[PDB]
Design a protein around this ligand. Structure first.
Ligand code: PLX
Ligand code: PEE
Lengths: 70, 83
């Protein structure tokens, strides 16, 4: 009676643990990958992250400058 | 109207320097926006060549660009001369 009215079968907890473990393992591997990706992007700078500004080239004036040699 | 006239008459007495200064400053602010010779001054400033006019390479598709200064095509300064 107690088992019927207060508790559930082993399958529920078993498969819930399976799902929880799967989620947590994915989160762990995601964290490790994210750290490695950050290291690579900060080292090389070829990614979208850690992009530091440079001078905009639309500011350059391309016109004769009173002197042939610029 | 009447109060403004009274104020201006009371200030024109015993404070003529301030009245004159405010009138002159107000005129200096307002009048330039209405004068028709301001654009003439801008055009005169544009017509003053400080730099060498660098010629453009002819490519067979430049009819409005002169080949010689004596040519009719190109900007003129007859408006400047008549001024
Ligand atoms: C001899 C026979 C009796 C044996 C003794 C049994 C006495 C049991 C008392 C102790 C109970 C321990 C806790 C049990 C309940 C745990 C919480 C919850 O799980 O129980 C819910 C039920 O709890 C009850 O609704 C409430 C219990 C409250 C007991 C209070 C007792 C004392 C009250 C005294 C009041 C006196 C009147 C006021 C006087 C001033 C149903 O659970 P549920 O989420 O479905 O579980 C999922 C699995 N299912 C679907 C298969 C069930
Ligand atoms: C939009 C134009 C603005 C730019 C022009 C102004 C440039 C320079 C002028 C401003 C300088 C600073 C002015 C500071 C004002 C202080 C005046 C003041 O406090 O003096 C009062 C008195 O002066 C006044 O009444 C205050 C101003 C009075 C009005 C002055 C002219 C206001 C405008 C009049 C003309 C406006 C436009 C033209 C209208 C006329 C028709 C064309 C007290 O005098 P005290 O020496 O301390 O003691 C005397 C008593 N024992």
């Amino acid at each position: 009676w107690i088992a019927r009215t207060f508790y559930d079968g082993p399958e529920k907890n078993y498969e819930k643990t399976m799902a929880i473990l799967q989620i947590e393992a994915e989160k762990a591997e995601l964290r490790l990958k994210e750290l490695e990706v950050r290291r690579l992007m900060r080292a090389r700078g070829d990614g979208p992250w850690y992009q530091y500004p440079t001078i905009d080239k639309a500011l350059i004036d391309h016109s004769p400058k009173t002197t042939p040699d610029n | 109207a009447g109060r403004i006239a009274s104020f201006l008459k009371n200030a024109w007495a015993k404070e003529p320097v301030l009245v004159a200064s405010f009138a002159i400053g107000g005129l200096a602010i307002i009048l330039p926006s209405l004068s028709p010779y301001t654009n003439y001054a801008i055009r005169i400033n544009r017509a003053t060549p400080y730099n060498y006019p660098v010629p453009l390479r002819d490519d067979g598709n430049m009819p409005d660009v002169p080949s010689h200064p004596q040519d009719p095509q190109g900007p003129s300064l007859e408006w400047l001369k008549n001024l």
